[PDB]
Design a protein around this ligand. Sequence first.
Ligand SMILES: Nc1ncnc2c1ncn2[C@@H]1O[C@H](COP(=O)(O)OP(=O)(O)OP(=O)(O)O)[C@@H](O)[C@H]1O
Ligand SMILES: Nc1ncnc2c1ncn2[C@@H]1O[C@H](COP(=O)(O)OP(=O)(O)OP(=O)(O)O)[C@@H](O)[C@H]1O
Ligand SMILES: [Ca+2]
Ligand SMILES: [Mg+2]
Ligand SMILES: [Mg+2]
Lengths: 340, 319
Amino acid sequence: MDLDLLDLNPRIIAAIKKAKLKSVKEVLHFSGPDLKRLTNLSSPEVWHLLRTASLHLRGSSILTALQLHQQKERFPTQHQRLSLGCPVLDALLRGGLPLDGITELAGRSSAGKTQLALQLCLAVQFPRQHGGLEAGAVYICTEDAFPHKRLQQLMAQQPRLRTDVPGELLQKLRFGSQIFIEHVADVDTLLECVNKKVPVLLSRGMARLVVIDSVAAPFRCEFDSQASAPRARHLQSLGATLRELSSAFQSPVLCINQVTEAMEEPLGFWDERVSPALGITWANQLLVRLLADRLREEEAALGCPARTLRVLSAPHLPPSSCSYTISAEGVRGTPGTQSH
Amino acid sequence: GPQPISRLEQCGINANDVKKLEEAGFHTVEAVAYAPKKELINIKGISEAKADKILAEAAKLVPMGFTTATEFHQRRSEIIQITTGSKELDKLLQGGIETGSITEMFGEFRTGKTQICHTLAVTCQLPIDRGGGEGKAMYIDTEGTFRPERLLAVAERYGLSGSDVLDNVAYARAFNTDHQTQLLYQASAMMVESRYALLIVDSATALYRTDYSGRGELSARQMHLARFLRMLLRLADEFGVAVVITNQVVAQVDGAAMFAADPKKPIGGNIIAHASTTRLYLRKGRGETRICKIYDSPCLPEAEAMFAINADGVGDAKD
DNA sequence: GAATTAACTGCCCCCCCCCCCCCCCGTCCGACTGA
Ligand SMILES: Nc1ncnc2c1ncn2[C@@H]1O[C@H](COP(=O)(O)OP(=O)(O)OP(=O)(O)O)[C@@H](O)[C@H]1O
Ligand SMILES: Nc1ncnc2c1ncn2[C@@H]1O[C@H](COP(=O)(O)OP(=O)(O)OP(=O)(O)O)[C@@H](O)[C@H]1O
Ligand SMILES: [Ca+2]
Ligand SMILES: [Mg+2]
Ligand SMILES: [Mg+2]
């Protein structure tokens, strides 16, 4: 259906037609011996066929790194960033979340993950100059009900938080109508949702941000310590699908994760009391891994809770940390607190 | 790809109205399909008839079936907040205890985790005007600590019929974790026949301390607790009831703690912390007064309040 | 006396800092107090 335009000899295309090969993806799916036995023809013509199919699929532009560096507008994924709404957090993240790959947020309960997720959901609708993407967001609740009251309070207090942006266009922004909420209850339900509903929303352009309220919640209620292989298969499939969608539509994916204690009797966590859940198979699918921690009254006997946001690993970010507080306006980082 | 706003005229609209919608900030069919009706009709010169017409055009043109935050808030804004019987606690919780969510109270020993449950079991039958929920109550017991004479005192305090209150509170006793989980299917069957407004489990994690013991049985215990909490969440979401559970405490016998005022943490690990929505921490006060503190909440700040346990139930500290 | 089999034990190294009280068992008398 598509290999017809390729230059070739009639014998090989007749063999392809007799062998029921549809597109270049199908022929690249099979290997050397498989194609040789299917077409029943010599090796050099198979090599020529593979070369021609590869040249058809790709291999046109010689893209150097100067084209990546200088041409800012040609490759937004390498330069454009999604701001977190607070200058201190953006400085810690050197601009914000990347537009490609998966970003993980992990921590214990009552740490402030949902507040950051809501702030990122609101912050995506700003124009590109103000650190937004001029699009909506998708929220997938996997554990419990969505906090509508807190979202309404944040929307009401939004003019107070965005002090730098002048407020003439703030009233034009319709925050409520550009946020989509979904609910799931099983691992299979979440897989079906990400397979079917999410691409429809991203392709048509309603939203350019995907948030999962708790990826670890469905997986902790089905698989025990003796069923690691099916869980690994499901995690690999979900990660592959999410990465493919994010790369295709240039939409950041933010995943919220839970933690489990060390239970001291590796992966880089030597003296840490808690570690991200879902094992190492899930950790291989991510790009930037964060961690939000709260020191309890033992260290928080000073009057107010102590919250620190830490960077665990990233291809372009040193391991750092800062501090932040949660108020009626949102999440704000404490100035002059970044650690080196 | 997205369908531009320049497609509306083929569906039965003139250039003037589609332009009027275009310069209003909207630029595609997808944006206007989910747009609120009042925000669509608040523009001067826009009639409701053509608004409904263009909404129908978008609905038959735009793939519908997607929930929106404004619709989610304006569709479920009739939630109910049951009063706890104490003005200070109602003020601290901003009206009381919400429905469709799980609220847990944890504390030590003689704190008021059962008196509060009894008071809620009584007050949940009040009319919505008086601060109730206008429904029955379900009490699942695991320690054999249910006293109807405590409900009678509250029913007399609020001027309700003594016999009627004891007829609206279904009771059940659990002897193990399997029985406790199995009772939820019967609860689901019963909640269809009538209308319920509250469900009480006391205590949720009392039996797990002794049914599974040691490091070897930790994983099975955690998974069983997670499945039980998932079933509770499903029930709360489906029937729109208020689920209140109670927890216990365990000591911290290591030297990390330094404030030395008997450090203690709730049991259950991370599953019970993540599953529940609002967590309260009750501690002993001077005399019969008690102090309630918000431990975790998605839309509330941590604070403190003082109440007391009286002959008529949970109330306010006397002067 | 000895070849042969059977039963009990063992697998290991990091925390050296120091605000923090909390709900009374005080021991009891002076005086208030309302009845
Ligand atoms: N005005 C406020 N409104 C809401 N929360 C506030 C406010 N002030 C402080 N907070 C804090 O915000 C926190 C919210 O916790 P949050 O829901 O983010 O926790 P989480 O465990 O990360 O969430 P989830 O389990 O839903 O992922 C509370 O612990 C509360 O102390
Ligand atoms: N009629 C009453 N008048 C005054 N106080 C009362 C009355 N009945 C009970 N109390 C007090 O209320 C408290 C009851 O504690 P409660 O049964 O609520 O504890 P809990 O948290 O459920 O404990 P446990 O962990 O043993 O289940 C006690 O301190 C008791 O003195
Ligand atoms: Ca929670
Ligand atoms: Mg949160
Ligand atoms: Mg009790």
